[PDB]
């Protein structure tokens, strides 16, 4: 009916710890990094310090409601929802979340979470100061949910800060499948390739 | 009644997670930054470290009470209130809040919140050392509410005399953008901090 | 009562959100700093980084018990008490509290809170390497309680001898700040630390 | 049963404070470190700054369920499980967990927890600049559970970042134990020998 | 009882806010710091950064159980327990607690708590490069409880990293009892003297 | 959605004190009484003691779920439901509910509630002992909701016990609207006229 | 604000244990009985069993709201409300409430509560078979609140059952203020005289 | 696992509102009345007052546990358990439960519940003073769950009945039956208890 | 303080299960039955049905407050207080409490509970139609607290009784009884209430 | 420790649902009925209406406390203790509890629960008006706990019986007995209580 009713129900009945699997189909999560800033780099030790909006999308039908004559969408705290347990496998610091931890929810149950994160990665930074630029690959996927429970897909400069000493040449994202020695099941991930270089003046 | 009553009511009934949209009008949010100190500036990196009191105001009519023979206003923990999900879109460090997270509530339901924040920005440091100075732009709007739910409206006595820097000018302009994709319009306040290194 | 009873009472009924305003009188808070240590000072940037005990004191009658055959005071976690929402007006860093967050409550409802706080300020660092020394002023007052709600009044020997600086003098004085936007005055204590490098 | 049911059962009944000893025989924990990155090294101070994944396995029958027409495993927040109070004996910073604080629970009540941790150790960094390399020993055991209550055992390179300034010669992992003359009791540890060198 | 029952009991009935004074006698606390590492010394600023296990011990009879067919000892989170409010009166950083915040409660009501703490101190670091070394005094006490409510007492190197830049010559720990200028009462305290030096 | 899921969502949401009004329209409550037995009649006081199944119905849309691959209705404690505050205006004993207090909830949010009630009324019993027989009128409406808020409406001896001493000739149920002096708003009630006689 | 909000505010801040004394003065409670039935009379025992509507009315300002775009009234459970602690001083069984225990709150704070009660009294049944009839006095008053805290007032047959064997010749309601020897406080009651006879 | 833990888990995971349906098949409830006494009988009004033990038996897999070194069964208050919403169709007074409202849970999820009920009923008392006695049929079945959600059964088509009664029991037959009403598609399953008894 | 703060403080800190003993000195309970009606007597069976106000009075200084600029008294549900565990040893029905279960709490912590009770007793009804009347004896005291825990005392301090009863009250006297049995080192007390009544003419 | 702390400890860690079984030995429960009055008797229907005190004692170790400088006993509402689920097999009315529902607890975990109950039974009232009298047997045992879990034993087999009953008691014996049933393969234990009574003059 109203904003307050919609948020009450989601709070009271939403099960944060419960992956919203559908008929035991993997939950499909969309992920696209939108880089905003490159804040520090190190060709010697091979580290980068980035700021990026982690465009993260997925469906949770248990959230959906009868719009009809009611709010299009709502803003929900992420404590009040299930959220994918995503990790950047090659981060070497923990996500500084820069933004209000609110996710935007539509009446169908499709969810949009997009926090600004500042994080430090460990990646190939050789060629940063050349014209070829460097290509730093960030791998992201489910920390605890494997192929049959979570799958991850990428999607279809307008963001990047003009005051950065760096400039992006190209950013590309590939779905991937890894396996581990311990474990018979495979995990999926988005491989994000940031090609960037130091500016000329 | 009295304070304890007025504060019990707010705590028992306030719903932090519910924007108080009054009849499907947008919650008007008045914003005004007051810089207190500038601390680290880098014309190479175009990064800055600043401290400012973000003077914020809006109306949550649910909070209202009958002023007749009772407190004009009370102080309240912002965990007991709805608060707009403001974010600085060029911030490169999380906001570090320096002061007690309390806000003031007037009997008419006007909420008045003024945190002291320290945060780092990616902005134009070009010219800080010259006469006409640097102009650093800081953009502040709601992180999840487009212009039908929240609408942000911008409203030296505050700046430390002991700063290494000096403030030529601060100006505030609203900013609205529609896109091909999405029928909702988005708003931010644009804060132009024109400052320079003292003699 | 015993210590358990008295704490339980304070836990159940201390309205930790409610200024213990008496009639409509400002709650009269006393603040008096004692410096333990000056740790890093910048004359260029006008930034000092200091450690100090904030002696705070105020009365809350919802706390009091008849010290009849009872303890005359107890230790109360500040989560379970009303505390003045104080702030350093010229702090450039969030207070680092170095101590257990406990306050002493007297049977008459007198509270004595004294945290050890490490924090950096903007203030006049100049003259630090001179005999007459630098004079760094800190202001501490309520963040939200104007002057009809919370008054503030001010009341070397704890100062570390291993410091690189020394305190020539420390005066503390009643002050109020007002702003053109806002109808109300806010009381503080203006602490003048006169000190110099060794 | 389904994910939501199992999760609720685990949250309602799993007792995070209660070591799941069986027939008072010590709780068998496996700790197996996978080094991801070596980031800083100081041959003067004998300190390393390391990133590893800590494969921690044990067993808690009270989490178990009938997997007849149910999930093989589910994912549970460690706050809703008893976890081993493991601690690095020679650690010089707080463990910085970089990953979702979530563990995997098998229906037979076996728990699979692999946090990704950054932390500094005081250890032997000598020879790092050389072909045979330094050997940094890292010691991990229960902080409060002596060897009648917990044993730690190793499980009876490949993830290390190829963009590290360092590489790995050998990793060996051996059960050991320790006492302190203040106190009667002994504590099992796994001793992780990291044989590495600069590239 | 079993661990399950003993822990449920404590979680249900322990008052972490209530000092376990018995018959208006003070709580005897054994405190004894054991240094593991010395991470950073500055002879200019007079500062050390150190890591210590702070072996802490005291009696809280309300915790006791009859140990007949029962555990002799259990691992309780300290949030379930009253804990002495110990400070280090010349710390310049907050105590960085590095290990799981659990304590040991013996069936007779004895609480054994040993955190590993990283913390920075303001002390005399002159003569660390000498041979008889620097002597860094640290003052440990209750913040809010006087000697009538807490007495703090020490205990009579096996722990210090052999790979430290530095080495410990001696560590001694004596009782001190102190009276401030403001207030009538005394606070019992410990003095810890870290006599140590560089290696070469 | 399973029954487990739906029941959770109802218990947790759903506000038993919140009349399910739509667009400030009256909530339409249907009520058909089904007499099961007449256990006492008295022509002198004019009193009967009856048992009846009170077939009750109304929509509450905050209860609805999409029953795509899911159950069509569920059984729900009325303590977790709003229910109409119906009263017998001419009752002289309190309703003695004989049955489990569970109502049925269809996925379109229709509530089907039907308790077995025993209760005693003040009504015209004259000539229960003749062919044409007594006609005992029972008025039922909401105790606190007027017509704009609630409309109690009727619907249109498959229930009645073959071993009673009485037999039902007729039951008719007609809409009734009533205005009390105190209060200018009007209640919307149902007159149940029970036409029965002794069998002999 | 819709009903569902008003009812939520009431439940969370209605302090049903607290008498809404406004300022100094007592709470003014209107009580007026409406007899529906007389059911069993015993002139030997001086006993009567009676069904009556207890129209009750008072002001709790704490329930108040602004109806501009709001209902004027909602129905509230008395569990979530302060109710006057009324007792019929000459009752000899407990009140059997025959109706839902819901009261009615006006936006200006007035409450209207009107239960149908069956209850037996001790009173003057003599002459119930004569022309002039019997006059049963029923004395209703606060059980714990004396006259400084509660004053009762009536407000100047019509729902009586024609199918009763008795008939009301008259009903009159006056106020009375009674003091007992133990206790220096005066209590108020309404005394309702029920002039009825057998038809 | 002990009694204490088993009961904690049940308490803590209790969904009393969730019919424990397994893969959309109906929950099979057994009902057997074991008559203890007959307190009052009326051939005029066709009413009897009776005390019986109602043995009831169903599965609820959600309560189960591993019974290796664990109790075989435990005692659980019914407010923690889902219970069949059972009801007599011809009852004329509330069921007066005389015993502790406790059932027994077995390790496999079986729930055995047996309350003592005193209740009045409307039935065929004709012939109570004859050689072949009266045959009062009592009909018991779920009030709100139909054929597809609950199915009943008698496990029982001299050890219980009071030797001191004014009546003897000749026979009690219990048969699965069913009941539908024109209003409502779904059939309801019931147990048909024929109490054939006489005055001595 | 206002009434609202006092009731909040009582509700929040009150221990109904806890006898307010002061240093293991016993809680002094005053009792006084003021009879209102006598409703049924039976000389064959020695049974009476009666209604009385049972005035109870005790101290619980843990409920005190500062009367300074406050109310001297407030009403409190008894379900938030400790109450005397009083039983009538010769009752044959359970006590029907006819009145609101509220009590008065005075600012010195004095509690004043007076319920109107209706109960049937097994007592000496003989002589009821004579001029000396019957004397029916009712014994009242704690069910589980011996006399080092609760001391019951009659206040003995007609005005209350129905002018419409068939019966009339000739005198009421109340006296303390106390007994030591050999099993237990403890004396038990009771208050013996002697209702001397006769039928009216 | 004081009463407030013993009661608190009991309230919080008692486990009212959990039978205090030790070493899978039966819990030994001791019921002795003490008769206060006989109120109705009916020779036609074989029914009596009686009032009695149900003396019930057992041991529950989870209640115990060290009673040095402590109360040795406290009074505890039965909601906060495990209580045996006793019932009168041959009862025909609900138990009417006439007394405060408190139980007395000894620091060693010994419990006395003694409600005055009024109830009605089906029993042999034959011979009530003869000099030999009727022998009404009442059976009281655990509803749901068979013999391997609850064992039931009387103590001893006047001072209680009202002098004003129409009736008089001749003897009360009380005897261990065990009833078993077709359906269910465990035996229950009971105190069979033989009331031998008759009418007075
Ligand atoms: C006038 C600014 N202040 C002086 C001291 N306290 C602050 C304060 C406290 C609470 C609210 C506000 C404020 C001011 C303007 C707009 C919004 N809030 N300031
Ligand atoms: C007299 C109006 N009503 C019609 C049916 N219900 C009643 C009603 C309900 C709720 C409150 C009141 C009321 C209360 C005080 C005074 C008058 N009426 N009446």
């Amino acid at each position: 009916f109203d904003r307050a009713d919609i948020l009450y129900n989601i709070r009271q009945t939403s099960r944060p710890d419960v992956i919203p699997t559908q008929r035991d189909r993997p939950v499909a999560v969309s992920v696209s990094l939108k880089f905003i800033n490159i804040l520090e780099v190190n060709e010697i030790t091979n580290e980068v310090d980035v700021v990026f909006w982690q465009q993260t999308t997925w469906s949770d039908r248990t959230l959906a409601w009868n719009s009809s004559h009611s709010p299009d969408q709502v803003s929900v705290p992420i404590s009040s929802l299930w959220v994918p347990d995503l990790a950047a496998y090659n981060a070497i610091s923990k996500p500084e979340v820069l933004t209000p931890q609110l996710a935007r929810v539509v009446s169908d149950g499709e969810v949009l979470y997009m926090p600004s994160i500042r994080q430090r990665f460990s990646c190939d930074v050789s060629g940063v100061d050349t014209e070829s630029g460097a290509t730093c690959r960030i791998k992201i996927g489910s920390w605890t949910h494997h192929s049959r429970e979570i799958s991850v897909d990428p999607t279809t400069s307008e963001y990047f800060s003009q005051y950065s000493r760096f400039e992006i040449l190209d950013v590309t994202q590939k779905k991937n499948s890894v396996t581990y020695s311990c474990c018979p099941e495979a995990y999926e991930d988005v491989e994000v390739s940031l090609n960037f270089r130091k500016k000329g003046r």
Side-chain angles (χ1 to χ4, degrees), chain A:
Chain A
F1 237 102
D2 67 356
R3 298 178 108 74
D5 285 344
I6 287 165
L7 289 157
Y8 187 50
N9 297 347
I10 295 172
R11 202 166 58 97
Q12 286 321 78
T13 61
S14 175
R15 276 288 292 279
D17 308 321
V18 193
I19 199 159
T21 271
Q22 281 312 309
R23 286 31 185 288
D24 296 286
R25 77 169 296 277
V27 163
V29 181
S30 311
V31 184
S32 61
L33 273 47
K34 275 53 178 153
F35 298 100
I36 310 302
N37 225 303
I38 304 201
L39 291 180
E40 169 186 22
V41 170
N42 191 318
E43 196 168 11
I44 279 291
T45 72
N46 258 145
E47 289 171 21
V48 315
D49 196 11
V50 170
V51 171
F52 62 94
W53 300 343
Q54 175 162 294
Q55 203 176 287
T56 317
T57 220
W58 69 91
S59 208
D60 186 1
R61 307 290 165 164
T62 84
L63 288 178
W65 71 80
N66 184 26
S67 208
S68 68
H69 199 267
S70 295
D72 35 289
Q73 299 189 36
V74 290
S75 303
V76 180
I78 67 176
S79 37
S80 292
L81 312 171
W82 179 84
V83 178
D85 75 319
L86 290 177
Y89 269 68
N90 66 292
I92 42 169
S93 76
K94 54 92 200 163
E96 213 176 355
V97 165
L98 306 179
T99 48
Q101 292 268 78
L102 299 180
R104 191 73 196 184
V105 182
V106 186
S107 58
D108 54 355
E110 204 272 72
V111 179
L112 171 275
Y113 173 46
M114 202 166 75
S116 184
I117 295 154
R118 164 165 199 166
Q119 212 180 3
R120 294 264 295 176
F121 292 88
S122 162
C123 62
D124 199 351
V125 157
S126 54
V128 54
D129 279 346
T130 85
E131 181 163 8
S132 339
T135 309
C136 174
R137 314 173 304 114
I138 303 172
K139 282 85 75 205
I140 278 156
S142 173
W143 194 235
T144 79
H145 298 281
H146 65 31
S147 32
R148 304 177 301 112
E149 281 179 7
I150 288 189
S151 48
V152 311
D153 311 66
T155 79
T156 185
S157 77
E158 194 192 341
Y159 300 84
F160 191 76
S161 165
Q162 74 187 304
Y163 299 113
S164 181
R165 292 171 64 205
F166 303 87
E167 57 178 350
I168 308 171
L169 299 153
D170 191 53
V171 181
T172 93
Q173 310 200 51
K174 302 295 171 40
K175 174 186 264 276
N176 226 302
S177 166
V178 179
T179 291
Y180 299 88
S181 329
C182 68
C183 306
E185 304 278 356
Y187 294 75
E188 292 200 351
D189 57 283
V190 175
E191 209 232 1
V192 174
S193 291
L194 174 52
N195 194 358
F196 75 114
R197 73 175 169 231
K198 189 156 87 158
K199 273 175 180 188
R201 278 170 168 179

